[PDB]
């Protein structure tokens, strides 16, 4: 008779104190101990018809673990105390637990049955604890599939989708090659996501495991001007286009020409590469120690930019966003089957609040910007308040408040208001057709206009998560396996 959901109160692991979180570039959290993990796992009530596994687009927002993790099963196993079996069940479906556990924002936590008026079960933390203990005990070893048939797939892009597809194809028994521009494989996991979230040691270890499997990565190959599509097709049967989505939309507003305005992706890549190279001693990155920092565009990118600026010890940081501040609890037009929209207060914000004593505040909302300053470097930024109003047929509209004009001092500025499709029309060597810079394909049956060309990941998904990328990689791997050999269980 499980009763944990009412006889236990949700807790959190041992996190490093915020006042020391700003000094060492290391993981800012640790997994549960044995007893704490067992207690947390006991909370899940063997939920029938679980809502933590639906994994489908609901009302424009994801809900449930898209890769269909056997969450009730390995929660029960965690409670029981058998860990190798739980690891086996987890790896049955998921392929990158060490990234999903410590990166994924956990829509499963937000949306499940137990989340009705009560804190949800820490699925993400249980998964992270399971995978970390497995790695520490060294139960994970290369599979080395004995069966192999001479074939060739040339996955392009080292992102999570590319890595998952390569692993699945290698387990199937088809030789693959990963073409990447950057020095190190991983894609976003290497440069985009900060060291804070994903210490690159784990990424490197996983890539070494894949190389031991025999993926045989090749680096510094932009597969554009360097290698032509016709030759690629002739030398390789299929090609899994995990090309990524790195084009970022720009603000067509006057004043965005002066030096100082930078792109969040380029800045993060430069900082991470510098750290991985020489502990940011090369002096080939962007410094903001004695200057103000303003980031435009709320979300994960904005949070990462704020964290990086804080670690670089900028004097002041302010985050701007048009969307009104989210409420502190569920509202009438939001329900537990859907991902909530409650105040989150994730990392990089409580730390800013604690460290900043003169200005202990964050989340300056309801205004983005307009025309900036000139004469060399940025001196000041103008801003005006907008409010969401109903127009026409009860349709949201953004109208500015003329009397709320304000001036902020900003010398460095970042733009991370969103992203666009793949890098088109740069990669026009193939015959694929795009609608909004995203290559055209449907969920399942990714066979595009040209034979042997398959969409995958954010290239067709727009903007998504690592779990979405992994699901797309697995599905495209199955699709191409069926296309080549006809019969393939998975």
């Amino acid at each position: 008779k499980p009763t944990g959901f009412m006889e236990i109160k949700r807790e959190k692991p041992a996190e490093r104190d915020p006042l020391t979180r700003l000094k060492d570039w290391k993981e800012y959290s640790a997994p549960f101990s044995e007893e704490a993990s067992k207690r947390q796992g006991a909370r899940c009530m063997d939920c029938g018809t679980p809502f933590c596994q639906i994994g489908a687009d609901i009302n424009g927002f994801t809900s449930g673990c898209p890769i269909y993790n056997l969450i009730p099963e390995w929660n029960g196993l965690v409670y029981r105390g058998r860990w190798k079996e739980a690891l086996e069940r987890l790896l049955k479906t998921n392929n990158f637990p060490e990234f999903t556990g410590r990166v994924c924002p956990a829509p499963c936590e937000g949306s499940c049955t137990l989340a009705i008026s009560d804190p949800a079960v820490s699925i993400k933390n249980i998964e992270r604890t399971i995978i970390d203990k497995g790695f520490e005990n060294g139960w994970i070893q290369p599979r080395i599939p004995k069966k192999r048939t001479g074939k060739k797939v040339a996955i392009v892009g080292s992102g999570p989708a590319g890595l998952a597809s390569a692993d699945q194809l290698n387990q199937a028994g088809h030789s693959v090659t990963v073409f990447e521009r950057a020095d190190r494989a991983g894609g976003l996991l290497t440069y985009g996501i900060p060291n804070m979230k994903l210490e690159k040691g784990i990424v490197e270890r996983r890539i070494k495991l894949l190389t031991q499997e025999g993926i045989d990565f090749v680096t510094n190959t932009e597969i554009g001007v360097d290698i032509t599509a016709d030759e690629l097709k002739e030398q390789f049967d299929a090609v899994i286009l995990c090309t990524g989505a790195q084009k970022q939309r720009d603000l067509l507003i006057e004043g965005r020409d002066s030096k100082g305005v930078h792109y969040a992706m380029d800045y993060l890549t430069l900082a991470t590469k510098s750290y991985l190279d020489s502990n940011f001693k090369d002096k080939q990155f962007i410094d903001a120690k004695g200057k103000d920092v303003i980031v435009i565009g709320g979300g994960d990118t904005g949070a990462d930019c704020v964290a990086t600026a804080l670690r670089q010890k900028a004097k002041s940081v302010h985050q701007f966003g048009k969307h009104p501040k989210l409420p502190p609890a569920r509202t009438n037009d939001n329900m537990w089957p859907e991902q909530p929209h409650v105040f989150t207060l994730e990392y990089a914000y409580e730390e800013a609040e604690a460290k900043f004593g003169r200005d202990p505040r964050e989340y300056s909302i309801q205004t983005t910007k307009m025309v900036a300053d000139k004469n060399g470097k940025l001196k000041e930024l103008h801003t005006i308040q907008m409010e969401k109003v109903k127009n026409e047929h009860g349709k949201y509209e953004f109208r500015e408040l003329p009397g709320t004009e304000k001036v902020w001092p900003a010398q460095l500025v970042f733009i991370a208001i969103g992203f666009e499709g793949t890098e088109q029309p740069l990669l026009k060597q193939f015959g694929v057709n795009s609608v909004n810079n995203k290559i055209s394909a449907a969920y399942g049956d990714y066979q595009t206009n040209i034979d042997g060309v398959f969409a995958a990941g954010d290239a067709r998904r727009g903007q998504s998560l690592i779990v979405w990328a992994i699901n797309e990689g697995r599905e495209v791997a199955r699709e191409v396996d069926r296309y080549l050999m006809g019969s393939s269980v998975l």
């Binding site: 029938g48 018809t49 679980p50 809502f51 596994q53 639906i54 994994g55 489908a56 609901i58 269909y68 056997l70 099963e73 086996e88 069940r89 049955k92 069966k147 387990q171 199937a172 329900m335 089957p337 269980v489 998975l490």
Partner: protein, 117 residues
């Protein structure tokens, strides 16, 4: 082993009590099942006395199903785990159920909003 045997015997006794046949010897001959989806010809040939309404699948279809299951199971060249069942619970990608989460929360939302679409 002993506990499993005792429990299975208790269950058999319960199934007997459901119908009212109080003797395993009598139930043994008794054919107290009603095939749902088996052809009348097949029933007459092999399950004579059993009741069937719609006829249904044939010996060839049964053989094809068995062969498909056997071939998939003996292929099984990807993992060393048993796929999760879906007889008494819903798991994504498993056997379909009448009350899936999509239907459940759509019905709840519609009922709470008084919206017809």
């Amino acid at each position: 082993v002993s506990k499993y045997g005792k429990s299975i015997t208790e269950g058999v006794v319960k199934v007997m009590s459901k119908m009212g046949i109080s003797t395993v010897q009598s139930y043994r001959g008794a054919q107290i099942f009603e095939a749902v989806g088996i052809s009348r010809d097949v029933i007459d040939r092999y399950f004579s006395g059993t009741a069937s309404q719609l006829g249904g699948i044939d010996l060839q279809t049964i053989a094809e199903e068995a062969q498909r299951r056997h071939r998939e199971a003996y292929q099984d060249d990807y993992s060393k785990t048993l796929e999760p069942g879906s007889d008494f619970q819903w798991r994504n990608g498993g056997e379909h159920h009448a009350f899936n989460p999509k239907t459940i929360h759509t019905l709840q939302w519609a009922c709470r909003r008084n919206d017809y679409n």
